[PDB]
Design a protein around this ligand. Sequence first.
Ligand SMILES: [Mg+2]
Ligand SMILES: [Mg+2]
Ligand SMILES: [Mg+2]
Ligand SMILES: [Mg+2]
Ligand SMILES: [Mg+2]
Ligand SMILES: [Mg+2]
Ligand SMILES: [Mg+2]
Ligand SMILES: [Mg+2]
Ligand SMILES: [Mg+2]
Ligand SMILES: [Mg+2]
Ligand SMILES: [Mg+2]
Ligand SMILES: [Mg+2]
Ligand SMILES: [Mg+2]
Ligand SMILES: [Mg+2]
Ligand SMILES: [Mg+2]
Ligand SMILES: [Mg+2]
Ligand SMILES: [Mg+2]
Ligand SMILES: [Mg+2]
Ligand SMILES: [Mg+2]
Ligand SMILES: [Mg+2]
Ligand SMILES: [Mg+2]
Ligand SMILES: [Mg+2]
Ligand SMILES: [Mg+2]
Ligand SMILES: [Mg+2]
Ligand SMILES: [Mg+2]
Ligand SMILES: [Mg+2]
Ligand SMILES: [Mg+2]
Ligand SMILES: [Mg+2]
Ligand SMILES: [Mg+2]
Ligand SMILES: [Mg+2]
Ligand SMILES: [Mg+2]
Ligand SMILES: [Mg+2]
Ligand SMILES: [Mg+2]
Ligand SMILES: [Mg+2]
Ligand SMILES: [Mg+2]
Ligand SMILES: [Mg+2]
Ligand SMILES: [Mg+2]
Ligand SMILES: [Mg+2]
Ligand SMILES: [Mg+2]
Ligand SMILES: [Mg+2]
Ligand SMILES: [Mg+2]
Ligand SMILES: [Mg+2]
Ligand SMILES: [Mg+2]
Ligand SMILES: [Mg+2]
Ligand SMILES: [Mg+2]
Ligand SMILES: [Mg+2]
Ligand SMILES: [Mg+2]
Ligand SMILES: [Mg+2]
Ligand SMILES: [Mg+2]
Ligand SMILES: [Mg+2]
Ligand SMILES: [Mg+2]
Ligand SMILES: [Mg+2]
Ligand SMILES: [Mg+2]
Ligand SMILES: [Mg+2]
Ligand SMILES: [Mg+2]
Ligand SMILES: [Mg+2]
Ligand SMILES: [Mg+2]
Ligand SMILES: [Mg+2]
Ligand SMILES: [Mg+2]
Ligand SMILES: [Mg+2]
Ligand SMILES: [Mg+2]
Ligand SMILES: [Mg+2]
Ligand SMILES: [Mg+2]
Ligand SMILES: [Mg+2]
Ligand SMILES: [Mg+2]
Ligand SMILES: [Mg+2]
Ligand SMILES: [Mg+2]
Ligand SMILES: [Mg+2]
Ligand SMILES: [Mg+2]
Ligand SMILES: [Mg+2]
Ligand SMILES: [Mg+2]
Ligand SMILES: [Mg+2]
Ligand SMILES: [Mg+2]
Ligand SMILES: [Mg+2]
Ligand SMILES: [Mg+2]
Ligand SMILES: [Mg+2]
Ligand SMILES: [Mg+2]
Ligand SMILES: [Mg+2]
Ligand SMILES: [Mg+2]
Ligand SMILES: [Mg+2]
Ligand SMILES: [Mg+2]
Ligand SMILES: [Mg+2]
Ligand SMILES: [Mg+2]
Ligand SMILES: [Mg+2]
Ligand SMILES: [Mg+2]
Ligand SMILES: [Mg+2]
Ligand SMILES: [Mg+2]
Ligand SMILES: [Mg+2]
Ligand SMILES: [Mg+2]
Ligand SMILES: [Mg+2]
Ligand SMILES: [Mg+2]
Ligand SMILES: [Mg+2]
Ligand SMILES: [Mg+2]
Ligand SMILES: [Mg+2]
Ligand SMILES: [Mg+2]
Ligand SMILES: [Mg+2]
Ligand SMILES: [Mg+2]
Ligand SMILES: [Mg+2]
Ligand SMILES: [Mg+2]
Ligand SMILES: [Mg+2]
Ligand SMILES: [Mg+2]
Ligand SMILES: [Mg+2]
Ligand SMILES: [Mg+2]
Ligand SMILES: [Mg+2]
Ligand SMILES: [Mg+2]
Ligand SMILES: [Mg+2]
Ligand SMILES: [Mg+2]
Ligand SMILES: [Mg+2]
Ligand SMILES: [Mg+2]
Ligand SMILES: [Mg+2]
Ligand SMILES: [Mg+2]
Ligand SMILES: [Mg+2]
Ligand SMILES: [Mg+2]
Ligand SMILES: [Mg+2]
Ligand SMILES: [Mg+2]
Ligand SMILES: [Mg+2]
Ligand SMILES: [Mg+2]
Ligand SMILES: [Mg+2]
Ligand SMILES: [Mg+2]
Ligand SMILES: [Mg+2]
Ligand SMILES: [Mg+2]
Ligand SMILES: [Mg+2]
Ligand SMILES: [Mg+2]
Ligand SMILES: [Mg+2]
Ligand SMILES: [Mg+2]
Ligand SMILES: [Mg+2]
Ligand SMILES: [Mg+2]
Ligand SMILES: [Mg+2]
Ligand SMILES: [Mg+2]
Ligand SMILES: [Mg+2]
Ligand SMILES: [Mg+2]
Ligand SMILES: [Mg+2]
Ligand SMILES: [Mg+2]
Ligand SMILES: [Mg+2]
Ligand SMILES: [Mg+2]
Ligand SMILES: [Mg+2]
Ligand SMILES: [Mg+2]
Ligand SMILES: [Mg+2]
Ligand SMILES: [Mg+2]
Ligand SMILES: [Mg+2]
Ligand SMILES: [Mg+2]
Ligand SMILES: [Mg+2]
Ligand SMILES: [Mg+2]
Ligand SMILES: [Mg+2]
Ligand SMILES: [Mg+2]
Ligand SMILES: [Mg+2]
Ligand SMILES: [Mg+2]
Length: 275
Amino acid sequence: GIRKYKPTTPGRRGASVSDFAEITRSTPEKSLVRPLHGKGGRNAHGRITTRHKGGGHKRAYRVIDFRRHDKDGVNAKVAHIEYDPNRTANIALLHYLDGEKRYIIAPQGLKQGDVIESGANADIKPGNNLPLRNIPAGTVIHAVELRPGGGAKLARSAGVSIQLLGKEGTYAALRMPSGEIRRVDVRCRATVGEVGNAEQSNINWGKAGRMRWKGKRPTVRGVVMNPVDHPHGGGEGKTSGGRHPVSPWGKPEGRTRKPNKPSDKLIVRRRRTGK
RNA sequence: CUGCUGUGAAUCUGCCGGGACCACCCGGUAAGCCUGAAUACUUCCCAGUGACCGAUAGCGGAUUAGUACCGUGAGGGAAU
RNA sequence: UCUACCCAUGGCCAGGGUGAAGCGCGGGUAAGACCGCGUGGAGGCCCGAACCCACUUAGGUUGAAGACUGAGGGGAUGAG
RNA sequence: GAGUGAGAAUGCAGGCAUGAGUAGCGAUUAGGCAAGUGAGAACCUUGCCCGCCGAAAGACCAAGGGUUCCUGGGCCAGGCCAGUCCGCCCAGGGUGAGUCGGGACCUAAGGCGAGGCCGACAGGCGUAGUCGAUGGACAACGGGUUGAUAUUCCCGUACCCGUGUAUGUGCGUCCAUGAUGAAUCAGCGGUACUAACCAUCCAAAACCACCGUGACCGCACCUUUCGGGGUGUGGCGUUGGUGGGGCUGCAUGGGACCUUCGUUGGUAGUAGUCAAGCGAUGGGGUGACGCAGGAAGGUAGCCGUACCGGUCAGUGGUAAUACCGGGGUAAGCCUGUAGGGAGUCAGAUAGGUAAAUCCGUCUGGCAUAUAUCCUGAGAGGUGAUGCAUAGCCGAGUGAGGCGAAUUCGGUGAUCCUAUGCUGCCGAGAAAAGCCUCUAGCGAGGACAUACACGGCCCGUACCCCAAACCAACACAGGUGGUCAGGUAGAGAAUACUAAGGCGUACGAGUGAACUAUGGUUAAGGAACUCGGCAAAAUGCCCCCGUAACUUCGGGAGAAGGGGGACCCACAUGGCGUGUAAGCCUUUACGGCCCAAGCGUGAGUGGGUGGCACAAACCAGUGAGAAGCGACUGUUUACUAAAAACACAGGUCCGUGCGAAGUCGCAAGACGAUGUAUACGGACUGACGCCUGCCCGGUGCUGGAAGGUUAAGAGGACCCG
RNA sequence: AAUUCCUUGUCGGGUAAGUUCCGACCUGCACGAAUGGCGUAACGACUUCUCAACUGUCUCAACCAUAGACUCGGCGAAAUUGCACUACGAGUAAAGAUGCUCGUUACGCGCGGCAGGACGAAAAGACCCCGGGACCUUCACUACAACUUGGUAUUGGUGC
RNA sequence: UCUGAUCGUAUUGGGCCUCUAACCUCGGACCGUAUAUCCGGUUCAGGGACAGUGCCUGGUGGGUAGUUUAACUGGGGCGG
Ligand SMILES: [Mg+2]
Ligand SMILES: [Mg+2]
Ligand SMILES: [Mg+2]
Ligand SMILES: [Mg+2]
Ligand SMILES: [Mg+2]
Ligand SMILES: [Mg+2]
Ligand SMILES: [Mg+2]
Ligand SMILES: [Mg+2]
Ligand SMILES: [Mg+2]
Ligand SMILES: [Mg+2]
Ligand SMILES: [Mg+2]
Ligand SMILES: [Mg+2]
Ligand SMILES: [Mg+2]
Ligand SMILES: [Mg+2]
Ligand SMILES: [Mg+2]
Ligand SMILES: [Mg+2]
Ligand SMILES: [Mg+2]
Ligand SMILES: [Mg+2]
Ligand SMILES: [Mg+2]
Ligand SMILES: [Mg+2]
Ligand SMILES: [Mg+2]
Ligand SMILES: [Mg+2]
Ligand SMILES: [Mg+2]
Ligand SMILES: [Mg+2]
Ligand SMILES: [Mg+2]
Ligand SMILES: [Mg+2]
Ligand SMILES: [Mg+2]
Ligand SMILES: [Mg+2]
Ligand SMILES: [Mg+2]
Ligand SMILES: [Mg+2]
Ligand SMILES: [Mg+2]
Ligand SMILES: [Mg+2]
Ligand SMILES: [Mg+2]
Ligand SMILES: [Mg+2]
Ligand SMILES: [Mg+2]
Ligand SMILES: [Mg+2]
Ligand SMILES: [Mg+2]
Ligand SMILES: [Mg+2]
Ligand SMILES: [Mg+2]
Ligand SMILES: [Mg+2]
Ligand SMILES: [Mg+2]
Ligand SMILES: [Mg+2]
Ligand SMILES: [Mg+2]
Ligand SMILES: [Mg+2]
Ligand SMILES: [Mg+2]
Ligand SMILES: [Mg+2]
Ligand SMILES: [Mg+2]
Ligand SMILES: [Mg+2]
Ligand SMILES: [Mg+2]
Ligand SMILES: [Mg+2]
Ligand SMILES: [Mg+2]
Ligand SMILES: [Mg+2]
Ligand SMILES: [Mg+2]
Ligand SMILES: [Mg+2]
Ligand SMILES: [Mg+2]
Ligand SMILES: [Mg+2]
Ligand SMILES: [Mg+2]
Ligand SMILES: [Mg+2]
Ligand SMILES: [Mg+2]
Ligand SMILES: [Mg+2]
Ligand SMILES: [Mg+2]
Ligand SMILES: [Mg+2]
Ligand SMILES: [Mg+2]
Ligand SMILES: [Mg+2]
Ligand SMILES: [Mg+2]
Ligand SMILES: [Mg+2]
Ligand SMILES: [Mg+2]
Ligand SMILES: [Mg+2]
Ligand SMILES: [Mg+2]
Ligand SMILES: [Mg+2]
Ligand SMILES: [Mg+2]
Ligand SMILES: [Mg+2]
Ligand SMILES: [Mg+2]
Ligand SMILES: [Mg+2]
Ligand SMILES: [Mg+2]
Ligand SMILES: [Mg+2]
Ligand SMILES: [Mg+2]
Ligand SMILES: [Mg+2]
Ligand SMILES: [Mg+2]
Ligand SMILES: [Mg+2]
Ligand SMILES: [Mg+2]
Ligand SMILES: [Mg+2]
Ligand SMILES: [Mg+2]
Ligand SMILES: [Mg+2]
Ligand SMILES: [Mg+2]
Ligand SMILES: [Mg+2]
Ligand SMILES: [Mg+2]
Ligand SMILES: [Mg+2]
Ligand SMILES: [Mg+2]
Ligand SMILES: [Mg+2]
Ligand SMILES: [Mg+2]
Ligand SMILES: [Mg+2]
Ligand SMILES: [Mg+2]
Ligand SMILES: [Mg+2]
Ligand SMILES: [Mg+2]
Ligand SMILES: [Mg+2]
Ligand SMILES: [Mg+2]
Ligand SMILES: [Mg+2]
Ligand SMILES: [Mg+2]
Ligand SMILES: [Mg+2]
Ligand SMILES: [Mg+2]
Ligand SMILES: [Mg+2]
Ligand SMILES: [Mg+2]
Ligand SMILES: [Mg+2]
Ligand SMILES: [Mg+2]
Ligand SMILES: [Mg+2]
Ligand SMILES: [Mg+2]
Ligand SMILES: [Mg+2]
Ligand SMILES: [Mg+2]
Ligand SMILES: [Mg+2]
Ligand SMILES: [Mg+2]
Ligand SMILES: [Mg+2]
Ligand SMILES: [Mg+2]
Ligand SMILES: [Mg+2]
Ligand SMILES: [Mg+2]
Ligand SMILES: [Mg+2]
Ligand SMILES: [Mg+2]
Ligand SMILES: [Mg+2]
Ligand SMILES: [Mg+2]
Ligand SMILES: [Mg+2]
Ligand SMILES: [Mg+2]
Ligand SMILES: [Mg+2]
Ligand SMILES: [Mg+2]
Ligand SMILES: [Mg+2]
Ligand SMILES: [Mg+2]
Ligand SMILES: [Mg+2]
Ligand SMILES: [Mg+2]
Ligand SMILES: [Mg+2]
Ligand SMILES: [Mg+2]
Ligand SMILES: [Mg+2]
Ligand SMILES: [Mg+2]
Ligand SMILES: [Mg+2]
Ligand SMILES: [Mg+2]
Ligand SMILES: [Mg+2]
Ligand SMILES: [Mg+2]
Ligand SMILES: [Mg+2]
Ligand SMILES: [Mg+2]
Ligand SMILES: [Mg+2]
Ligand SMILES: [Mg+2]
Ligand SMILES: [Mg+2]
Ligand SMILES: [Mg+2]
Ligand SMILES: [Mg+2]
Ligand SMILES: [Mg+2]
Ligand SMILES: [Mg+2]
Ligand SMILES: [Mg+2]
Ligand SMILES: [Mg+2]
Ligand SMILES: [Mg+2]
């Protein structure tokens, strides 16, 4: 949940931290972890393609299974629920009966010791993973694939879920987290439930340092820079830029979705803004 | 005459040239290939010549010279 | 090889204070809220060396120095 | 025929004046004397004093340098003066490793990159690879020696890899020993072709009743004069629909013949299969990890002391009572304590890119013990009849020789247990290595002792917070790591000092002005000045006492005020420590208590002295109000540190996933090993209260009715 | 008012006396709501004003010590430089004279001091102008990358 | 044959619907391969004559680039 600090110092004052209430264990599986390093927002040319990234507290990658297909009718019990740097949600550590350990994105209402079965025959209880064709229309699902066997892609993040609106032919129509309605192939798997840590968003970081640890460097505002740097720059005084707002690279505001994309044939409407 | 993109022919009353283009004359025979000599040049060696220099000149360099020395480096660069 | 940011891997940070959550004991109640006292040892917390800066001032100003020196000054478990 | 004429280009090269025998001669330590050498001495050698550093200006290294090191010479250049001296010049010498730092071991970021993809060409990325320590793994310590090296040589004692022989154990295949095992035929039940059996579903062909009537027939009524035409009914035909009854097929479920599979009689525990040791390039464990924080248990060091050796320091007092100097010794091998860590046997199972007795998971049983096992500080033993040492001898640069005691306490680490434990959230490298598991090799091979051997390449001198490196200089600057004595003190601050090291390269004088850097000051006390700039002041410990306002934490060390030296008494006390004794035992590296001994405050009472008792050094100025920025941060290296930038928070716009966005001609990359509670962009900037009106202008978003509009189609007309 | 030209606006407070400061007034030259508006505890080597304490900052200076300066010994530079046995006054002149005129004053040579002049030294004025650059802006001109429109090639079949 | 209305057989463009065989897939699974998230191949599942890429063409285009931006003037600007 949210544990709020007492203002014992000006930094800590508004701030809050996640009460980690769902954490059974502090120490990830030595098998399922890969090493990882920060790129600091620089590509293979070493240039900065993505500004504002860097700093950061060194972190190791847990290998999540988004791919779950293999195990069928093999029931797993949830061993621990532990904490993952790389993503917003938690991760459940499953033990199959096969004696194979896997991580999954921890669903909502998943408690330690539960049973979870993936396959066709499975129940519509939380945590279970089944192809969209076997799911009663109108449920709430998450970690959804795109193509049949393309891994889980939609609705991974904390507190978030997809409503499955219906079924026609080989297309099942989903309402995305964004509020946008998109069609998809009924062969592709989904997981049943919402996603844990729905309080994630009310964490109030409270001091610059904290955001630094988490990896974000500071951001300089356009209007401040010289006109050589940024299009908004310049002026003697404070300015509003005196120009219609743009990126630092001069491209204006507006729709950036490139038209003609293939998937565009699937999409029923895009999200609506400020309605 | 020639590049790329399209369209796309005829085999000798054929086809291409004769400064848009058309006729008549003349010339030639595309879309296959080789080919010496006459012409250009001197890192390098031999033999010379000079109304060229003669040591602040002549090569940056007659003396340890691309050395000493300067510069992270590309590079610069003496004096006797 | 200076400097700006990043990445990997190491090291450093005398000494002193303050006393967060949590936990415990007693109170308080129907059970709470809540109130003492204990542990406990949080923090871009406080005082202050190493260290990192460079605020004021005096001197230097063909300098000891192509940017220093002396007095004081700021940060000093952290965006170090 | 001219490279033909110079006074001037802040002209170029060289030589030389003027300033001028002038400024300087490089800190914040400081030198003096006697003798010595020598042509010559403020500066060189020795001696005796004095002074300075002492978390350094001492000791040892990395980087960098490259002979600067040692001996013997030198003394025109160099050294800011001289010079016999030198870090300068000349000659010779000097660097010794199985273990220390690296390679032959391992990988991180990153580099390169066979094929490869992309790119007119040049090339851009990148897979397998292979490199790349600042990290991981891996075996040594004390003492002595030379003019110069030493964890390298030597002495003593270890450890780690390999190789050969010899000996003894115990195993092996051959022989055989255990364990098991499945295969076929033969006696049987439910899977299950196939004809049915049972139950139900449905309706072609449809039997019947009713209504609706393509059209036809027309009886009756209305209608225009009559027609057209509308209505009521029936005869039927069925573009038709509805309710009841049966046959046929169909599907499904249930038992059953075929078939098979499972079960058990014969064999065939016979022909099979495995088992000594090696064992992966394969599987699994481990390796393997943040930051903070103590508490605890230890030692190193230091301070005492039993004991040992010694001195009389021409002064008033002091012969042992006083004083000075000793009061040492490693790795390793034993031993396994404080601390910390751990459930274990049997069955099944294929999940672990084949197989696994291993690992995982599921079952079970058996365990709450100080049981067991691993780990591990230090105590103790050995190492050590040795080595070292305070001194004492004579010889004298020096050589060498002898060599006493070598107990018990206190204090105490930032070091060790500890890569531990406990919290916390920001969730904290890899690979080799070592341990195992089989695949696989295998007739031979393991284990111990003894003996004999092999142990490679590079660094190794000297400087290293500096006159030896970077700074053009023998330059007040810069440069990472390791050691850390004493008395005061909270302390690695400061003061004084040990060990050790220096006095550092111009001097000698002299009361000038003036300048700098320190010092003191009657009376007044900001009158100074742009401005209390600069000084002065405050300053420590322990008590007392503290306001407005407040986001309830702060403000606050607010302000303001008191005590502090020495001596005695309380006190043969209080607290810490802990020995003898005592008590207790599961008798051990035990526990409990502890007279003595050593250490140390705090306080109360009484004295004593001074101008002053935080006596030096060290060490907050405080209070009221306003603007700006919430805050810690950051910034114009070399005139600007702020009110600027950042910030946590806010709102908007974009982005549905090799996304948007950026880097690239592309491939590809980052975004992100993320997925709308996420990511990019823009403005605002903690918190509180709030955020009004305008869509004409110009942007963005959406929309096509028109109006305008390219190439492509179209070739009427016209011309040759 | 970090915004108010007129302006030291007007009043109150503080001072013996206040162009600054604090509090109001509103006649806002030319405030105003995320280029945010109005507040705000804590914080500031920020700016501004007042007070206590304390003082050589001052009335008004004095004395002392070191390091320079000064003397002697040794070494031994620099920037600068058309010349030279290089006065002053009133004038004159490219309009500010050591150097010209008329006068007045002054023995030769040093040494220590001070800074009025030498339009002193330094740096081919940074201000201003003119010419030339550069870099920045944009509904200046013209282009190009990027982004996009339709045609055509790669590109085919059956249907309406 | 003409003022004109039509069918069916041709030609030829326009829209629309589908299909699969070009083409596309950072979808799967095997193989090259002992080791490869590279790359290539086979196959499966999808898209599908669209998209992408050429050539032609119209836009948008301070994102970048080259440049221009007068003179007189009782200094220059403003004015004229
Ligand atoms: Mg590169
Ligand atoms: Mg960003
Ligand atoms: Mg998380
Ligand atoms: Mg947030
Ligand atoms: Mg905050
Ligand atoms: Mg910003
Ligand atoms: Mg700016
Ligand atoms: Mg720039
Ligand atoms: Mg711009
Ligand atoms: Mg600006
Ligand atoms: Mg402005
Ligand atoms: Mg704005
Ligand atoms: Mg602007
Ligand atoms: Mg949004
Ligand atoms: Mg040819
Ligand atoms: Mg020459
Ligand atoms: Mg000559
Ligand atoms: Mg060089
Ligand atoms: Mg406490
Ligand atoms: Mg408490
Ligand atoms: Mg702090
Ligand atoms: Mg502070
Ligand atoms: Mg200073
Ligand atoms: Mg001076
Ligand atoms: Mg200082
Ligand atoms: Mg300080
Ligand atoms: Mg201070
Ligand atoms: Mg401090
Ligand atoms: Mg000439
Ligand atoms: Mg001449
Ligand atoms: Mg000349
Ligand atoms: Mg000259
Ligand atoms: Mg001279
Ligand atoms: Mg002079
Ligand atoms: Mg003189
Ligand atoms: Mg002098
Ligand atoms: Mg000196
Ligand atoms: Mg000096
Ligand atoms: Mg003498
Ligand atoms: Mg000391
Ligand atoms: Mg070194
Ligand atoms: Mg000598
Ligand atoms: Mg000499
Ligand atoms: Mg000399
Ligand atoms: Mg020497
Ligand atoms: Mg030599
Ligand atoms: Mg490469
Ligand atoms: Mg190649
Ligand atoms: Mg290597
Ligand atoms: Mg290393
Ligand atoms: Mg030595
Ligand atoms: Mg040694
Ligand atoms: Mg790990
Ligand atoms: Mg831990
Ligand atoms: Mg201790
Ligand atoms: Mg006597
Ligand atoms: Mg003694
Ligand atoms: Mg097991
Ligand atoms: Mg021992
Ligand atoms: Mg620790
Ligand atoms: Mg050997
Ligand atoms: Mg060397
Ligand atoms: Mg050595
Ligand atoms: Mg050495
Ligand atoms: Mg030293
Ligand atoms: Mg220099
Ligand atoms: Mg040097
Ligand atoms: Mg020196
Ligand atoms: Mg130096
Ligand atoms: Mg340092
Ligand atoms: Mg000390
Ligand atoms: Mg000190
Ligand atoms: Mg001293
Ligand atoms: Mg000494
Ligand atoms: Mg004098
Ligand atoms: Mg004097
Ligand atoms: Mg003075
Ligand atoms: Mg006075
Ligand atoms: Mg007085
Ligand atoms: Mg006053
Ligand atoms: Mg005044
Ligand atoms: Mg005055
Ligand atoms: Mg004033
Ligand atoms: Mg001051
Ligand atoms: Mg003072
Ligand atoms: Mg208090
Ligand atoms: Mg006080
Ligand atoms: Mg206060
Ligand atoms: Mg005892
Ligand atoms: Mg007894
Ligand atoms: Mg007992
Ligand atoms: Mg008295
Ligand atoms: Mg203080
Ligand atoms: Mg106000
Ligand atoms: Mg600030
Ligand atoms: Mg604010
Ligand atoms: Mg800075
Ligand atoms: Mg500056
Ligand atoms: Mg500051
Ligand atoms: Mg400054
Ligand atoms: Mg800034
Ligand atoms: Mg806010
Ligand atoms: Mg923000
Ligand atoms: Mg934000
Ligand atoms: Mg993109
Ligand atoms: Mg906006
Ligand atoms: Mg702002
Ligand atoms: Mg509008
Ligand atoms: Mg509009
Ligand atoms: Mg409009
Ligand atoms: Mg509106
Ligand atoms: Mg539009
Ligand atoms: Mg046309
Ligand atoms: Mg004001
Ligand atoms: Mg006024
Ligand atoms: Mg007034
Ligand atoms: Mg006043
Ligand atoms: Mg006011
Ligand atoms: Mg205004
Ligand atoms: Mg508004
Ligand atoms: Mg606005
Ligand atoms: Mg603001
Ligand atoms: Mg305000
Ligand atoms: Mg305020
Ligand atoms: Mg600050
Ligand atoms: Mg400040
Ligand atoms: Mg003097
Ligand atoms: Mg002299
Ligand atoms: Mg000169
Ligand atoms: Mg005149
Ligand atoms: Mg005159
Ligand atoms: Mg005259
Ligand atoms: Mg004359
Ligand atoms: Mg004179
Ligand atoms: Mg003068
Ligand atoms: Mg002067
Ligand atoms: Mg002057
Ligand atoms: Mg000029
Ligand atoms: Mg100009
Ligand atoms: Mg196409
Ligand atoms: Mg196209
Ligand atoms: Mg543009
Ligand atoms: Mg431009
Ligand atoms: Mg041009
Ligand atoms: Mg003009
Ligand atoms: Mg004018
Ligand atoms: Mg004029």
